[PDB]
């Protein structure tokens, strides 16, 4: 009667238990994850490395007759007949110089490679750096490590190598970071007579803020700074931590991955770009690692350059990288004020033995610091551990029928 | 004795179970949610649409005597007596022109509407676009779709309509995005003699980056770009996914919502603004959808303009929109360098048949790209599913008393 | 036989239960937390306070002979012998003035304090503010509250004090925020003849956006705005809510913490900086709270200034603050256009009785507003409540052995 009528109700209770338990178990086998995000004002924070590059790759006063011979075409300074292009943007003063050192009448070529050309004619930290201060202490060129990029001879402050103890940061604000005054030296910019990958229409510098153990990709990922301004960059360190499989695609940062000691997206890209250029050109660009021969100006103009433009512009399948397990991103907010003021133009002009207009067209101040909330963690965390699954399917087993693994295994037998 | 003394302890065990189970069940009926945030370097990413507008709405050379007659007051070029205001910012060259075409002695008005005025006098992509490149390929005006905003005749790159396959992006960096050189043509800016909603004190352009299926609100939400700089915009695609009720207020993006095929905040605003202007003015602005008649200059000056200023400035209750279930936000970091350099000014001047000063005051380069971590997901996820509640209240039922639904329903009866 | 052979299997079942239950209980005693992040288009949002400061601290026309006597050395206008430094950046017009009022032949010093000097010579909101509009309504200096910073006499719009109902914001876009036109008055900038903490090489202003009940730290945390541009700041209100111990280090915002009614990182810093300066100098700077005597120019130059530079640059242990439970951060995206255009330069020049060049070097427009997704919540939430632990260890107890607290306590006794 009523005792056996709610045994069918018991059949319904079993029917329910089936759907709910298969729910929590499919949910387990989706491997769901959630996010733990903590923005905080840190302490003992490690100051990142700061790489910068002048937008003019070579110095007009340092280009020699041999430099002009080997590389004048790459720089659009000579046509294919080793002469000044008749379609040149004449300057009565500059053109006299160039056609004086473009006179190869008594000239016999001498050995030449691009790395020495960049290292020698590239802008010099010792005459660009007008002022550097970190947390109240003044820097020198000794504190900037020479690094070569596609821009040429570039510099990294707080590179952290050289056994030099990396610098730290405690609070937020300008006084707890870097400030540098620079002269971009527009009077040393090479004439632009055509368009190549080595000349530019812009005056200023390129900057990129990165981990000490992450290489720079300043050509693609950096930001610019204009002459005649003071730029404030308020930063924030964002540490991103991902889960390995099966929860997500994530590569161990101690990656057994060629040219660099640390695995990062940028390093993976530079690796592949190097393999690609060596493979297709038998030639490496000045900034690439490895041991291939550096490209000659003809190899730069004909093979290496379009190879890299292809990799960073058109390629969709050859070169793609995985996500690491640890990634460091730097949020930033930029801001400008004008330099110099009328009250100070004559002061700066006098101090550096330069014209007032020159100061207006070449001088530049850069402040790099962190805000109050200077450190941020974005860590992926597992959302349904196996134990919580067993405890849940357990409260579900016990709910509708009050069974156990003993009751089943024992009752499945006896 | 001791057997019946811990039956009171059993009463305490029941007392505990009550509070804990009512805890997990109230917690269920709060409908709590958490967040799943994944910043990643994507692939096959869809490039957004990029809308831009010159800050000068009309071209001084294209304003005709009929255009000046109908609209000269809206542009503060004529007072209420159809004449040059005596309080004009005289220019010996410009004033001769305007008062030459403000001579209505032999003039009889001709038909006129604002849409044709904007379309004709508005700046032209074919003479502003000095250079466009996307991922190594050069663009033409064919790649820019004409869109009308409150600025006038504006343009959208990669609008994605026209059956043109939307463009994709793979890596981070400048080479994997758009770069355009523009001439803002300050020599064609109309004289500003007063303050209206059609004239501006600033030179440059306005830009807004949006989904192909999200309309632009460039007047309110866009950013500016100044002449004489190259601006870098490092972007990041942020996909935001919300939960529908009862977990949150969230509107289905396939919204059955008038003028556009997709529901977005911006489209909802443009919808309501159109209804409002039609209702209160019997008149639609040139950029609004629907089928009302376009406003005459008198309707613009007297009714439509203050109506829209009211909606976008003062309104607090008439026009408010819900949150969609899918939202696309684009993070961005801006950066400038100066253009032109001294080395290149004469080059650019020669190439475009323009003065060096003109190049300094009108020329502008814009790079739009993504960083390495170019894609970000912010998805709301349910925090306490019903199954996990039952499994939990289950481990709680089994803990203190070891009961089941059978034990109760059966014991509640027999 | 087979009945007693799976009692050893029962021993294995117990072995499993031990590890899994000790897993969920250690997990409980790690006190894990997760994050609830909601970016939304809000309504009835409270507009923050906006503090700004001219980069020139004193006005050259307001510096009197007594002001020059007491403070001329602090400003690098006089050497240690109360005379013009022979290494001055001469200006035939300015130098006549200064050496006219540096003539102390018939001068006897008069009482002097830095607060009155700042208040009097500091730039005036009533002659800098050329235009202010909030949500369609125009502002006056009445809407700006005077606040003193290390820059001097500064101003805060929508300070929210004075019983003035704080302003609200509804939508995203320029029309739903503040726009102001300013003259930085480079013609009133004091000559810079040396480097001190009161003079600057830059022209423009400093801005900081903060809660009405959070003090400004504009020297360290603010951003700059350059003359000759219109700058757009697209903002986003981010409310961060942390967990108190034992889940995290977090201080109650109703903090019983000295000089201010609300606990914030900035207020904690200003508190400690004040204690430090009073302790080490018997002296407070003009912008610090409390009741110590203000510093004399000699105390500024010799003790107070290097004390604060030390605190904001070098200090690593003396002054460090805890994290509050509620923090308000404002995301922002900046953007510039040039001002004035050629079409409008003469207009603005005429309107304000100023030269066209002056307009180009001193005039500045600032728009502060929010984007569509104008409000963001980042709330830490508990990840494993005690009830869910008991329900889980419960489904685990019931799973392997089907026990209960009664079964144990009763069986541990009888
Ligand atoms: Cl690559
Ligand atoms: Cl609206
Ligand atoms: Cl401090």
Numbering used by the authors:
A (entry chain A), B (entry chain A), C (entry chain A): 42 to 455
The article reads:
Acid sensing ion channels (ASICs) are voltage-insensitive and proton-gated members of the epithelial sodium channel/degenerin (ENaC/DEG) superfamily of ion channels that assemble as homo- or heterotrimeric sodium-selective ion channels and are expressed throughout vertebrate central and peripheral nervous systems. ASICs exhibit a simple three-state gating scheme, populating a non-conducting resting state at high pH, opening upon exposure to protons and quickly desensitizing, recovering proton-sensitivity only upon return to high pH. ASIC1a activity is modulated by endogenous divalent cations including Zn2+, Mg2+, and Ca2+ and the modification of ASIC1a gating by extracellular Ca2+ has been an area of active investigation.
Crystals of desensitized Δ13 channels belong to the H3 space group and were obtained at low pH. Inspection of anomalous difference electron density maps revealed a strong, ellipsoidal density for Ba2+ at the acidic pocket, indicating the presence of at least one bound ion. The proximity of numerous acidic residues indicates possible coordination of Ba2+ by Asp 238, Asp 350 and Glu 354, all of which are located between 3.4 and 4.3 Å from the Ba2+ site. Notably, divalent cation sites within the resting channel’s central vestibule at high pH are absent on the desensitized channel at low pH. As such, the absence of an anomalous signal for Ba2+ for the desensitized channel, in addition to the presence of titratable resides lining the binding site, suggest that one or more of the aforementioned glutamate is protonated at low pH, thus disfavoring the binding of divalent cations.
